[PDB]
Structure 1
Amino acid sequence: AGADEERAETARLSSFIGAIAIGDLVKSTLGPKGMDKILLSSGRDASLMVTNDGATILKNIGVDNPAAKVLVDMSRVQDDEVGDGTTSVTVLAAELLREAESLIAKKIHPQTIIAGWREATKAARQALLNSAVDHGSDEVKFRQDLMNIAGTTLSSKLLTHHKDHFTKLAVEAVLRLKGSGNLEAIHVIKKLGGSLADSYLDEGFLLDKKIGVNQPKRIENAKILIANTGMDEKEKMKEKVERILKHGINCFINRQLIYNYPEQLFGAAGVMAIEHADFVGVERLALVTGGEIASTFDHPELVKLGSCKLIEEVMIGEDKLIHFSGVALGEACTIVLRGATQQILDEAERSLHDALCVLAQTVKDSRTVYGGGCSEMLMAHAVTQLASRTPGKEAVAMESYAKALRMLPTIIADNAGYDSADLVAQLRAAHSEGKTTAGLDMKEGTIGDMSVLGITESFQVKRQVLLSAAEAAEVILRVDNIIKAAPR
Structure 2
Amino acid sequence: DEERAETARLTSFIGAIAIGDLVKSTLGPKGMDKILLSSGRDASLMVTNDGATILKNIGVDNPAAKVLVDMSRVQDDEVGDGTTSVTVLAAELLREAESLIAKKIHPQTIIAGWREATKAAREALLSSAVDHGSDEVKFRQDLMNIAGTTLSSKLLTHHKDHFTKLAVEAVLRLKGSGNLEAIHIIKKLGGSLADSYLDEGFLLDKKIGVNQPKRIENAKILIANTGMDTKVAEIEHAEKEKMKEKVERILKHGINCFINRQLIYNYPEQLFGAAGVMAIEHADFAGVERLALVTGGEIASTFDHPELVKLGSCKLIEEVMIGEDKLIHFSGVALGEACTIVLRGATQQILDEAERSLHDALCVLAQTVKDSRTVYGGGCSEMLMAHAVTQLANRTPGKEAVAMESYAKALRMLPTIIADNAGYDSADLVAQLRAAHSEGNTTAGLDMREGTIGDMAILGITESFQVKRQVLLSAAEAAEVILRVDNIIKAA
Q: TM-score, normalised by structure 2?
A: 0.85
Give unmatched runs, 5+ long, in structure 1: none
Deviations 1:115-156 (A, max 9, x none): 212323433334324533342221693623633122222222
Shift of 1:307: 2.6
Question: What is residue 223 of structure 1 aligned with on the other side?
Answer: 220
Distance change (3 Å), C-alpha of 1:331 and 1:284:
same
Provide, for residues 12-68 of structure 1, a one-character-per-residue CA deviation record: whole Å limited to 9, x for no partner.
222222222222332332212224444232689984665544334424553334531
CA contact (8 A) 1:204 1:327 kept: no
Following TM superposition, by how much is the alpha carbon of 1:326 offset from its aligned partner in structure 2, in angstroms? Answer: 3.1
CA contact (8 A) 1:33 1:416 kept: yes
Whether the 8 Å CA contact 2:162–2:197 is kept in 1: the answer is no
Structure 2 CA distance for partners of 1:278 and 1:461, relative to 1, 3 Å: closer
Cα-to-partner distance string for 1:307-359 (whole Å, 9 max, x where unaligned):
33232223443521333343324454432233354646753233223223221
Larger RCO, structures 1/2 (Cα 8 Å, 6+ apart): 2
Give the drift of 1:401: 0.5
Kindly indicate whether the alpha-carbon contact (under 8 Å) linking 2:322 and 2:328 is maintained by their aligned counterparts in 1: no
Distance 1:112 1:63, change over 3 A: closer
- Greater CA drift, 398-407 or 326-335: 326-335
CA distance change for structure 1 residues 18 and 314 in 2, over 3 Å: closer, same or farther?
Answer: farther
Structure 1 residue 315 corresponds to structure 2 residue 324:
no
Contact 1:153 1:351 (8 Å CA) reproduced: yes
Shift in alpha-carbon separation, 1:293–1:58, aligned structure 2, 3 A = closer
SS of equivalent to 1:337: strand
The whole-number CA distance in structure 2 between the counterparts of 1:256 and 1:44 is: 35
Does structure 2 retain, via aligned residues, the 8 Å contact 1:412–1:440? no
The separation in 1 between residues aligned to 2:17 and 2:273, in whole angstroms, is: 62
C-alpha displacement of 1:91: 0.7
Hey, what's the Cα distance between the residues in 2 that align with 1:51 and 1:97?
26
User: Which stretch of structure 1 is more off in the superposition, 13-22 or 157-166?
Assistant: 157-166
Residue 94 of structure 1 and its aligned partner are, at CA, apart by 0.8
Deviations for 1:436-470, whole angstroms, at most 9, x for unmatched residues?
Answer: 22211122331122223221111112221222222
CA distance in 1, matches of 2:84, 2:431: 25
Deviation at 1:362, TM superposition (A): 1.6
Q: 1:408: how far off?
A: 2.2
The one-character-per-residue Cα deviations of 1:145-193 (angstroms, maximum 9, x if unpaired) are: 6331222222223553455754664554565442425533533122213
Write the deviation string for residues 268-312 of structure 1: whole angstroms up to 9, x where unpaired: 343322234345532331122334474545465435333332322
CA-CA distance at 1:220 after TM superposition:
2.8
8 A Cα contact 1:291 1:304, kept in partner = no
1:366-413 residue CA offsets vs partner (Å, 9 max, x unmatched): 221111111122222222222222122221111110111222222333
Residues 121 and 388 in structure 2, CA contact (< 8 A), matched pair in contact too: no
Residues 261 and 282, structure 2, Cα contact 8 Å, conserved in 1: yes
Worse-matched range after superposition: 97-106 or 211-220: 211-220
Displacement of 1:213: 6.2
Determine if contact 1:163/1:348 at 8 Å carries over to the other structure. no
Percent identity between matched residues is 98
Quickly say closer, same or farther: Cα 1:293–1:470, change in 2 above 3 A: closer
Q: Structure 1 466/299 Cα, relative in aligned 2: closer, same or farther at 3 Å? A: same
Q: CA RMSD, aligned part only? A: 3.4
1:226-266 per-residue CA deviation (whole Å, 9 max, x = no partner) reads: 22554476635743653455322112211121254432232
Instruction: Structure 2 unaligned segments of length 5 or more: list them.
Output: 230-238
**Aligned partners of 1:303 and 1:47: how far apart in 2?**
52
CA 319–101 in structure 1, closer or farther in 2 if over 3 Å, else same: same
**Do 1:170 and 1:352's aligned partners in 2 also have CA atoms closer than 8 Å?**
no
2:254 to 239, 243, 248: 248
> Residue 110 of structure 1 aligns with which residue?
107
> How far apart, in 1, do the equivalents of 2:92 and 2:196 lie?
40
User: How many residues were matched structurally?
Assistant: 483
> d(CA) in 1 for partners of 2:227 and 2:264?
6
Greater CA drift, 88-97 or 8-17: 8-17
1:63-88, Cα deviation, whole Å (9 max, x unpaired): 33453122222233333443315731
The 8 Å contact of residues 206 and 322 in structure 1, kept in 2 or not, is answered as yes
CA distance in 1, matches of 2:7, 2:199: 57
Given the two structures, how large is their TM-score scaled by the length of structure 1?
A: 0.85
What is the CA–CA distance in structure 1 between the aligned matches of 2:482 and 2:301, rounded to whole Å?
Answer: 52
Instruction: Judge which range, 233-242 or 330-339, deviates more.
Output: 233-242
Distance 1:333 1:207, change over 3 A: farther
Q: Report which stretch shifted further, 256-265 or 389-398.
A: 256-265
Q: Contact 2:379–2:446 at 8 Å: present in 1 too? A: yes
- In 2: Cα distance, 1:384 partner to 1:276 partner: 56
* 1:152–1:185 distance in 2 versus 1, CA, 3 Å: closer
Is the Cα contact below 8 Å between 1:254 and 1:277 reproduced in 2?
A: no
Check whether the contact 2:112–2:400 (CA below 8 A) recurs between aligned residues. yes
Tell me what 2:417 maps to.
411
